Design an enzyme around this catalytic site. Structure first.
Site, PDB file in Angstrom:
ATOM      1  N   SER A 168       4.377   2.204   8.672  1.00  0.00           N
ATOM      2  CA  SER A 168       4.196   1.042   7.818  1.00  0.00           C
ATOM      3  C   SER A 168       5.539   0.583   7.303  1.00  0.00           C
ATOM      4  CB  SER A 168       3.328   1.403   6.620  1.00  0.00           C
ATOM      5  OG  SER A 168       1.998   1.132   6.920  1.00  0.00           O
ATOM      6  N   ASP A 188       0.119  -7.759   1.353  1.00  0.00           N
ATOM      7  CA  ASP A 188       0.471  -6.340   1.401  1.00  0.00           C
ATOM      8  C   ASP A 188       1.982  -6.182   1.603  1.00  0.00           C
ATOM      9  OD1 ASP A 188       0.167  -3.537   1.483  1.00  0.00           O
ATOM     10  OD2 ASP A 188      -0.702  -3.618   3.537  1.00  0.00           O
ATOM     11  N   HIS A 223       0.815  -1.249   0.000  1.00  0.00           N
ATOM     12  CA  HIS A 223       0.000   0.000   0.000  1.00  0.00           C
ATOM     13  C   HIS A 223       0.831   1.273   0.000  1.00  0.00           C
ATOM     14  CE1 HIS A 223       0.056  -0.405   4.535  1.00  0.00           C
ATOM     15  NE2 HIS A 223       0.203   0.905   4.451  1.00  0.00           N
ATOM     16  N   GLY A 225       2.664   6.411   8.846  1.00  0.00           N
ATOM     17  CA  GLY A 225       3.998   6.466   8.284  1.00  0.00           C
ATOM     18  C   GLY A 225       4.993   5.494   8.884  1.00  0.00           C
TER      19      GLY A 225
END
Ligand code: 10L
Lengths: 642, 645
Positions: B137, B79, B55, B135
């Site tokens: 991730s 993901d 993502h 942020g």
């Protein structure tokens, strides 16, 4: 009138052009689409001058053909800046025989009909989401024949929907054009026959609050000098005895001395606690550090401007070194060195070389107390004599002599008066911001933001005072100075209620005098809104207010008040973090959801909206609320054709 | 375990490296701070592979020493993407002895303790606002020995506060390095002996909807071909009986033909209107355009996957040219010309030159109804044959035929099958996103966002079909393909209630089959939440529903239901926007504040929150809600401590 847009720069060009300040592409159109690194908005040329909003441009230069164009006009009060339009740039011409039918040109090149309702206002024929107007600050309101009436600066909202627009009228620009760009504010004014507010802009060392009050007293006047700092107020009393043979009156919370002398030094807070001006008491009043945008100073200055005339004063001096719109300039005594990455100590993504701070007295500014404890430890891990200072701690933890690295927040600025061999600056601060979130009411959020020029200059000014110094920094960025958030107005009513026994109505009169006085820091006018909500906060629990006052955290009134409501419904607070510690003992009896009045932090409990005070504040949110909507760079234009 | 950060590039360097794709700075540390032009997040090196979230990175390249490094692994369903780390860079390594006390390293170099609660979940000892996790991730969850347990991909939220974290386990990264880096799917699968779902990824023109099903029926199988477009579906039927000698069954709203044949062509909608799989009927179901993230397609494919094995089929084929994660790549028949500021016709900040479109037949993609009408009304001023096409207009407004410049939205690509000399792409589209805004409940907002790879591909693909084409565009680049918003889940429940007589529980069973099937476009799993909302929306006014269904706008069940609640309180709608036209009749009798259920647009009237349905929806917002938190460029790093905590 119709319009369409033309993009002339992309990301890469916009960053390169912003660093160098050289924009070669020819300025065409009358409406430009402009951009800083953080924001995009509009600029409009009138009478050969490219105009835009101060809240977007700040004091920045405009990148141009021969490099950076510095601003020819700056007026923070009108929210207006201008740069001499580059050679061969069209101008809209002023509109004199003005229609009530105006057209607002947005950055999407839409042409929105507006009906004029006053010098600075216009109703939108069809209301629109406020999000739709954002980025269109500084674009033109045109009369039907395409001549400029003003530039857009803010939407007027009901519950997130814009129904009216606020603009800077063309006449205000002509006033600003005919004003002198350079005005001398460095000397103390003479005392006039009738009341006057005057401004003194002068470095620290000119003697704004030592020499100039000395000089006034010598001519036979009684002078009151207000300062936001206790440590500074106290310290003036010793200096003035030594240096000018005056033993002045000193008024702080911790300590007062009445000698009967003709000069008094007071905090703003103690001035407020004493109930403001005494009739007859003073001829001149000097508001020192009037760049200060903390709630006690704003309320204090506002009090002097409301009361001074009627209590017999003839002169109010608003004094500071960093007035609104001022920019950080070189200091002859201070060497400035960007931090690199080679160093033993990590510091906001850069590094501090141990050699820079081993031996000597040094100050490192951090945005938070958590980071001060962190750095004060990592520095004891390498054998440096370090110490943390922030609100709560006593100033005595700072050794008056000997080597030390003081790791401090801005609390340092009012707790301690001394200087240092060097200053290292994270270049960021913690600020509070209000969001009109309607979930159910408003939210006050804490953010870390880039420092402004006032903060940069006050931080740097802790070194270089009559001896050489070094200022090391993480970033050269610096947001526009002289503005503050509506949440500071909320704090003013909060303190009015919690400390100074002011009614909200009373608090409005004082803040109104502040807002309506030009040349002070500026803010959105939300007095009615905030007055309306504090007016309904009735029958607070004295006991809860007492604890929130003494714990000394922010919004003691609103916190205590929520506590009050939760405790009367045997219901828990929004959460069990320290904010609601005034309620720990009552815990085991407290169950169900929280009757939530507003959000002052994370809300971990379930909530109900059925409390009558929540409904009152929700009804308050229907008020009209005016919200706003390296070099500045032209990135596109809006071409205008009905 | 402690951590601190190091910034290695500023904004200027970051843009230059993202464009060149060349980064000389050596890669120190295990945990990199990375950025795209739009976002910033983390990336963690494990076992010589630098991993981050799909993502954030999409299929983008990583800037490296010799140039852009292509992705070695791309798993949209987990993901998870991975680039081969440059030689010499440090990597973390997996935890060996299975601890349950975890540490999340955030982009701020904070280390927050987490209690492992499952293969891929862990709860925050101290619950925090989600904003603080954004942020981070791609960051690691470390065991107490400093070894990698997984990477952070999402936060589990109650009402805006993160109480748990979702992560991609380090196992799934072994599961991934333990497989081929390339797979095929280019050929139609052979019919297996027992039920199987298969993917077919093949160019348009492969005859994925014509040639492959004819084959299967040659072997004596019943085959159903599902497509999103009524035009495409009639077009395949008409093409089959001609160049193939089978008169297939055709099922659409406008035209239904039962010939008794063993091929059947249907839209997903008629299939749903028919109550999905009529047991025993088909052996193979081909789901064409399974990349489509319209609600009708998601619901159809989900129905096929829940029902097909139990109804006796042996094969489901999920068919598309543009599967999740696919990059746009040059098409040999099509020349691609960036528009510039020079041209007579203003077009999204750029300009189209007239010469480029005067002779012939051309297609201009615009984002909205109003831009088409304006750009048509202008182009016919300059004197060109310009017709606007968009939802609510007749496919026949286009000539077949003459010279023409058609100015269209994406509706074009369901209404109309023909192609063109050149395509002009604004490269943006309109999307709906949901925002859990608690004001009082949720908000569905419409925004104009940058197009993705699927969209560029299908828009470009209306030129250069076996001849020659010109593709003109306003902007290069794409956001990643194969992801859709939670609002689309909401639309499926709405469509289920409004059109297909599905109860919310039934809709959940179909969508669950879809989410759980890999290789399909992905979305955050908000099934329990949306089901709860719709379960409470009872006793809708059938007359309002019938008007919103016929008017053709989005969320007709949610609109009719708000209209129903308002009419029954004798209250006004949220505004007098077009959206609320089913209440216009009643305007004079309607007074007071609107009992607001949710926000579908601007709310201009005063609102009351006391309606029981508002409270019920407010209570549904307590559900656990999982939310996500040029070359990609390394702009900094997070150094982890080597000893102690
Ligand atoms: N320049 C300005 C910024 C923000 C608010 C205000 C209000 N007047 N001028 C303002």
């Amino acid at each position: 009138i119709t319009a369409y847009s033309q993009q002339t720069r992309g990301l890469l060009g916009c960053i390169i052009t912003s660093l160098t300040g050289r924009d070669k592409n020819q300025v065409e159109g009358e409406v430009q689409v402009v951009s800083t690194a953080t924001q995009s908005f509009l600029a409009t040329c009138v009478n050969g001058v490219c105009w835009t909003v101060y809240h977007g441009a700040g004091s920045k230069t405009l990148a141009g053909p021969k490099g950076p164009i510095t601003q020819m006009y700056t007026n923070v009060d009108q929210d207006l800046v201008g740069w001499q339009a580059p050679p061969g740039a069209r101008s809209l011409t002023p509109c004199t025989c003005g229609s009530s039918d105006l057209y607002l040109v947005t950055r999407h090149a839409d042409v929105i009909p507006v009906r004029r309702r006053g010098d600075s206002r216009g109703s939108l024929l069809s209301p629109r989401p406020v999000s739709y107007l954002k980025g269109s600050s500084g674009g033109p309101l045109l009369c039907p024949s395409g001549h400029a009436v003003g530039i857009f600066r803010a939407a007027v909202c009901t519950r997130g929907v814009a129904k009216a627009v606020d603009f800077v009228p063309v006449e205000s620009m002509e006033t600003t054009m005919r004003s002198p760009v350079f005005t001398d504010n460095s000397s103390p004014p003479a005392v006039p026959q009738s009341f006057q507010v005057a401004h003194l802009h002068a470095p620290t060392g000119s003697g704004k609050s030592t020499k100039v009050p000395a000089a006034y007293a010598a001519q036979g006047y009684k002078v009151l000098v207000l300062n936001p700092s206790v440590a500074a107020t106290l310290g003036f009393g010793a200096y003035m005895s030594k240096a000018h043979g005056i033993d002045p009156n000193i008024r702080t919370g911790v300590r007062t001395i009445t000698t009967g002398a003709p000069v008094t030094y007071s905090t703003y807070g103690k001035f407020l606690a004493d109930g403001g001006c005494s009739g007859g008491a003073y001829d001149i009043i000097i508001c020192d550090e009037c760049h200060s945008t903390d709630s006690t100073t704003i309320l204090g200055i506002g009090t002097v401007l409301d009361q001074a005339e009627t209590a017999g004063a003839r002169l109010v001096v608003l004094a500071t070194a960093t007035p609104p719109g001022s920019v950080t300039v070189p200091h002859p005594n201070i060497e400035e060195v960007a931090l690199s990455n080679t160093g033993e100590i990590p510091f906001y993504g850069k590094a501090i070389p141990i050699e820079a701070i081993r031996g000597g007295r040094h100050l490192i500014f951090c945005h938070s107390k958590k980071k001060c404890d962190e750095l004060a430890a990592k520095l004891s891990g390498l054998g440096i004599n370090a110490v943390a200072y922030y609100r709560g701690l006593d100033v005595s933890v700072i050794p008056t002599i000997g080597d030390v690295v003081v790791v401090a927040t801005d609390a340092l600025m009012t707790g301690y008066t001394g200087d240092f061999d060097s200053v290292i600056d994270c270049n960021t601060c913690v600020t509070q911001t209000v969001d009109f979130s309607l979930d159910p009411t408003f939210t006050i959020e804490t953010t870390t933001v880039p420092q402004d020029a006032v903060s940069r200059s006050q931080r740097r000014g802790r070194t270089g005072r009559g001896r050489r110094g070094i200022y090391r920094f993480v970033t050269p960025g610096e947001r526009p100075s002289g503005m503050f958030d509506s949440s500071v107005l909320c704090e003013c009513y909060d303190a009015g209620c919690a400390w100074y026994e002011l009614t909200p109505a009373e608090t409005s009169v004082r803040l109104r005098a502040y807002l309506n006085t030009p040349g002070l820091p500026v803010c959105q006018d939300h007095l009615e809104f905030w007055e309306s909500v504090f007016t309904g906060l009735t029958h607070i629990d004295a006991h809860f207010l007492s604890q929130t006052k003494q714990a000394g955290d922010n919004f003691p009134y609103l916190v205590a008040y929520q506590a009050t409501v939760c405790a009367r419904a045997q219901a828990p607070p929004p959460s069990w973090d320290q904010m609601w510690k005034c309620l720990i003992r009552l815990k085991p009896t407290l169950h169900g959801p929280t009757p939530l009045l507003y959000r002052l932090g994370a809300v971990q409990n379930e909530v109900t909206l059925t409390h009558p005070i929540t409904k009152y504040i929700m009804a308050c949110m229907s008020a009209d609320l005016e919200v706003v909507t390296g070099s500045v760079v032209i990135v596109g234009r809006i071409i205008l054709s009905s």
